[PDB]
Amino acid sequence: QSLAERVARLVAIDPQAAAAVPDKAVAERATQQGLRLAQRIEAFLSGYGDRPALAQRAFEITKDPITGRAVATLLPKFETVSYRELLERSHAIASELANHAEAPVKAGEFIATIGFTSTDYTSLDIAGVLLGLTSVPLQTGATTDTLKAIAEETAPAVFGASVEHLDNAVTTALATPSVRRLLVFDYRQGVDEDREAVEAARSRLAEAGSAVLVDTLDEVIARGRALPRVALPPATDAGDDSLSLLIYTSGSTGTPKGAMYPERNVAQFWGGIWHNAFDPDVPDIMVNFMPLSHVAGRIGLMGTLSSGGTTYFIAKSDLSTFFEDYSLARPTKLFFVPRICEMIYQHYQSELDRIGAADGSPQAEAIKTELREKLLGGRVLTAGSGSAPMSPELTAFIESVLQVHLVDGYGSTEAGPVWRDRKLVKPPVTEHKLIDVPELGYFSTDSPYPRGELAIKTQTILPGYYKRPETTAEVFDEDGFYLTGDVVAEVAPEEFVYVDRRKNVLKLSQGEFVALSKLEAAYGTSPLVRQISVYGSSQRSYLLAVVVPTPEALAKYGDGEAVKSALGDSLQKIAREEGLQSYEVPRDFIIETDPFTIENGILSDAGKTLRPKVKARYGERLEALYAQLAETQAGELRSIRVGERPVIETVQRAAAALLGAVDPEAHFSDLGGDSLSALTYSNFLHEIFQVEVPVSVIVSAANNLRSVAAHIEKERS
C-alpha cells in the first residue's frame, strides 16, 4: 500500500531490484561537507563498484548480401556498463586529453558537445568534470548558425560529437578557430556507416586545410587506459565557484543565453537537492529519453548514478522504440514530460477503438492493466512529470493507469527546483512574492486567488548568464529576487498553480521553450502574409496563429480552408529553410480579413502588435481550435472503419488527423508534428494494414506520403 511497503515487497521478490538499492554509506562519503565535485563523483562511482550503472540496447553487425556493407541492427535486449567501468573509461579520457602531445587541455578551457544521451556522452561529461573543464552541451536541433554563435561566445578548445551529428560538428568547428580537437563518440567499430561518416569529416577538414585533429572516443580511451590518472581536484581558479557547466536556455529572452553552473550547483544533480523536486530508499531503475543538453536529462541521469541505480537509455533518438524499451527495462521510477503522457493517452484511445470498448468499462480497464503491467513493465513505484503543465484530466488518466501518485515538479535552469505538488521546496527556496502583471490582468488582489509573476530567493540561483551582465540584470529586481517569468495563482500559504507567462516565450508539452516573437518574424516573410500573431497554450503540443493574409492571397485562395492550406505549405517551407522545429509550425489559423490597426486597439501607437489585445479579441476562438481538434480526433475511428478506399487515401487522411492540417506529395516531417507523432501514425497504419510500417520509412527526407502507401502495398505482397 504505502511506498515503503511497496519497496519492501519488490526487494523481497526481485533480485535485480534488491541489488540496486541505495547504500547510505556511499552517499555519506560522497556528499560530505567541503568535498569538491570531482571527488564527489569519484566517490559515488567507485563506491557502487561492480553494479550495473548504464544500459544500451545491444546490436549485431552482419554483412549485407546485396551491398556487401556491414550494417548494425538492434537486438531485443540491453547490455550494461558497470560503475567501475564508467569511472575507468572517464578517467582514461581525462588522462588522454590532459596529456596530448600537441594540444593538451588545461583546467578552465571549454568543451562543446553535440549528442543525444548515451554511455559515451556520459563518459565525456564526467571526464570534463575530472579535468576541470567547462562543459557546453549543445542542442541537437539547433541550426549551425546557433551552434556557431554559441561556439563563438564560449571559444571551446575541444568539440565532441556523436556520429549522427558529426557533419554539423565539422561546420561549427571550421568556423571556430579555438577548436583544436574533434572527438567522435557513439562510434560503433566495424559498422560501415559510422566509418564513412568519420572519413567524410576528415575530408572536409582536409579540404579546408584545417589543423583540427579528429579522434574517435574509443581510441582516446584506449590511449588513456595506458596513462596515469589525472590528480583530483583539478587546477581551476575558484574551487566550488569554478565554472563547470553552461546550460543554454531561451526562456528569458527568446535566444540562447548561457546559464552559468558553478561546481557547487552541478553537485546538486549528483545526489544533492534536486532529489527533492520529486522527493524511504527506492531502487532507481530508469529509462532516460531526455537529451543531456536539457536540465531534465541531467537530473534523471545523475540522480540515478548518485543512488547506485541503473539508467537504460532509449535505443533511438526518434523515440520510435519507446514501448519496447520500457517493456524491456521495466523501470521502477518514471519521469514524463506531458507530451509522453498525451501519447500514452492517444494509445489508450486507439485500443478502445481496436477492441470496440468504451469509457470506464471493464475491458477498458483491462487496457490500463496491460499498459501498467506489460507495456510499462509492471515495476513502477513512483512517477513524476515537469517541464510544462499538465491538464487535470491527463493527470487523472495517468494516475488511473499507473496506480501511483504522479508528482508535479516545477523548477528551472536558472532557479533549481522550486515546487513539488504546489508546495515550495524549502530548501533551497528561502523567500517568494508575487508581482502584478496589469497588462495581462493579473493582480494580487484577484479573487478567489492572488495572481502574479512568481519571484524568489533561492540557494540554487544561477550567478549569471555567461558574458551577458545585461541579460542577467533583467531577471533580478532591486531587492535581489529572481523573476521566473511565470505567472501563478496562490491557493494557500506557499502553494501555487501555473497560469501563464509574463512575456513572449513559453513551453509546449514537449518541455522546450518556443519564442513566439522569433517565429513571427520568420513567418512574416511569407509572401501570403500581411500580419501574423502566433499563439500557444502550454498544455498543448503545437501552435496556432492569427493571420491577416495579403489581399492578393485572400483573392487567389479565399478566406477559408484553402488559404489555410496555402499558408501551411508556405510556413512549412520557411520552417524547413530556417531550421525551426517540427512543433513550431502552426497547425491551424484564424484567418482575419480585417487588418490589425491602431484604430482596432491591436497595434500600439508605434505600429507593433500587442499580444494581450490579440488574446482578448481572438483568445476564445484560438482556444476553440485547440479544443475542437482534441474533441474530434475520433475522426480516426472513421478513417479505421474503411477498406472501402484506396491505401493512399487512408495514409493521407490519417496524417491529416494526427498533424491537425493534406496532399499526396508532402513529407510527414514537413507537416509539423514531432517524432512521437510518427510513432502514433506507424501503429495506426500497422493496425489497419497488418503490415510493419516503421518510422524510418515515414521520416527519411526522400520519403513522401506516396512512398508510405507504396511501402505498405509492397509489404502486403
Binding residues: 294, 387, 408-409, 413, 486, 498-501, 507, 608
Among positions 472, 510, 539, 639, the unique one binding Na ion when judged by CB under 5 A: 510
Cell of 498: 501555473
Shortest Cβ 199–ligand AMP spacing (Å): 37
Enclosing H/E stretch for 337: none
Name every residue whose Cβ is closer than 8 Å to that of residue 250 and which is 6 or more positions away in sequence. Answer: 256, 257, 505, 513, 515
In the list ligand AMP, Na ion, none, the entry touching 117 (Cβ below 5 to 8 angstroms by class) is none
In the list ligand AMP, Na ion, none, the entry touching 410 (Cβ below 5 to 8 angstroms by class) is ligand AMP
Shortest Cβ 510–Na ion spacing (Å): 3
- How far apart (Å, rounded) are the C-alpha atoms in residues 532 and 609? 9
In the list Na ion, ligand AMP, none, the entry touching 683 (Cβ below 5 to 8 angstroms by class) is none
In the list ligand AMP, Na ion, none, the entry touching 325 (Cβ below 5 to 8 angstroms by class) is none
In the list ligand AMP, Na ion, none, the entry touching 453 (Cβ below 5 to 8 angstroms by class) is none
In the list ligand AMP, Na ion, none, the entry touching 510 (Cβ below 5 to 8 angstroms by class) is Na ion
Say whether the peptide bond before residue 448 is cis (omega within 30 degrees of 0): yes
- How far apart (Å, rounded) are the C-alpha atoms in residues 662 and 652? 7
Shortest Cβ 308–ligand AMP spacing (Å): 26
- How far apart (Å, rounded) are the C-alpha atoms in residues 163 and 184? 6
Closer residue to ligand AMP (CB): 268 or 320: 268
Name every residue whose Cβ is closer than 8 Å to that of residue 357 and which is 6 or more positions away in sequence. Answer: 363, 364, 367
Shortest Cβ 416–Na ion spacing (Å): 20
Residue 516 contacts Na ion per CB under 5 A:
no
Per-residue three-class SS string for 478-537: CCCCEEEEEEEEEEECCEEEEEEECCCEEECCCCCEEEHHHHHHHHCCCCCEEEEEEECC
3-class SS of residue 77: strand
- DSSP annotation of 179 reads -
Cell of 37: 565535485
Residue numbers at the binding site for ligand AMP (CB under 6 A) = 249, 251, 295, 386-389, 408-410, 412-413, 484-486, 498, 507
In the list Na ion, ligand AMP, none, the entry touching 508 (Cβ below 5 to 8 angstroms by class) is Na ion
Closer residue to ligand AMP (CB): 109 or 408: 408
- How far apart (Å, rounded) are the C-alpha atoms in residues 348 and 354? 10
In the list ligand AMP, Na ion, none, the entry touching 677 (Cβ below 5 to 8 angstroms by class) is none
Long-range contacts of 60-69 (CB under 8 A, 24+ apart): 61/188, 61/190, 61/191, 69/192, 69/193
Closer residue to ligand AMP (CB): 315 or 456: 456
Segment interacting with Na ion (CB under 5 A) among 159-167, 422-430, 504-512, 692-700: 504-512
Residues at the binding site for AMP are 294, 387, 408-409, 413, 486, 498-501, 507, 608
Say whether the peptide bond before residue 76 is cis (omega within 30 degrees of 0): no
Name every residue whose Cβ is closer than 8 Å to that of residue 216 and which is 6 or more positions away in sequence. Answer: 183, 184, 185, 187, 198
Closer residue to ligand AMP (CB): 409 or 660: 409
- Angle among Cα 266, 271, 272 to the nearest 5 degrees reads 60
Shortest Cβ 61–ligand AMP spacing (Å): 38
Name every residue whose Cβ is closer than 8 Å to that of residue 687 and which is 6 or more positions away in sequence. Answer: 350, 354, 640
In the list Na ion, ligand AMP, none, the entry touching 194 (Cβ below 5 to 8 angstroms by class) is none
- How far apart (Å, rounded) are the C-alpha atoms in residues 440 and 443? 9
Instruction: Give break positions in the chain: residue before each, C–N beyond 2.5 Å.
Output: 279, 661
Closer residue to ligand AMP (CB): 413 or 565: 413
Residue 112 contacts Na ion per CB under 5 A:
no
Residue 560 Ramachandran class (φ > 0 left, ψ -120 to 50 alpha, else beta): beta
Name every residue whose Cβ is closer than 8 Å to that of residue 292 and which is 6 or more positions away in sequence. Answer: 113, 115, 116, 117, 121, 122, 125, 137, 298, 301
Shortest Cβ 660–ligand AMP spacing (Å): 23
Closer residue to ligand AMP (CB): 250 or 633: 250
Shortest Cβ 251–ligand AMP spacing (Å): 6
> Could you tell me if 629 and 539 are in contact, meaning their C-beta atoms sit under 8 angstroms apart?
no
Residue 512 contacts Na ion per CB under 5 A:
yes
CA-based nearest residue to 299, from 261, 266, 256:
266
Closer residue to ligand AMP (CB): 163 or 461: 461
Q: Which residue is nearest to ligand AMP (CB)?
A: 413
Among positions 124, 182, 424, 508, the unique one binding Na ion when judged by CB under 5 A: 508
Closer residue to ligand AMP (CB): 162 or 484: 484
CA distances from 70 to 66, 82, 134 (A): 11, 28, 37
Closer residue to ligand AMP (CB): 402 or 591: 402
Residue 674 contacts Na ion per CB under 5 A:
no
Kindly state the number of chain residues that form the binding site for Na ion, as judged by CB under 5 A.
3
Shortest Cβ 673–Na ion spacing (Å): 13
Closer residue to Na ion (CB): 133 or 508: 508
Shortest Cβ 507–ligand AMP spacing (Å): 5
Closer residue to Na ion (CB): 10 or 543: 543
Shortest Cβ 663–ligand AMP spacing (Å): 36
Segment interacting with Na ion (CB under 5 A) among 188-196, 279-287, 509-517, 621-629: 509-517
- Provide the pairing of β-strand 406-412 with 423-424: unpaired
Q: Which residues bind Na ion (CB under 5 A)?
A: 508, 510, 512
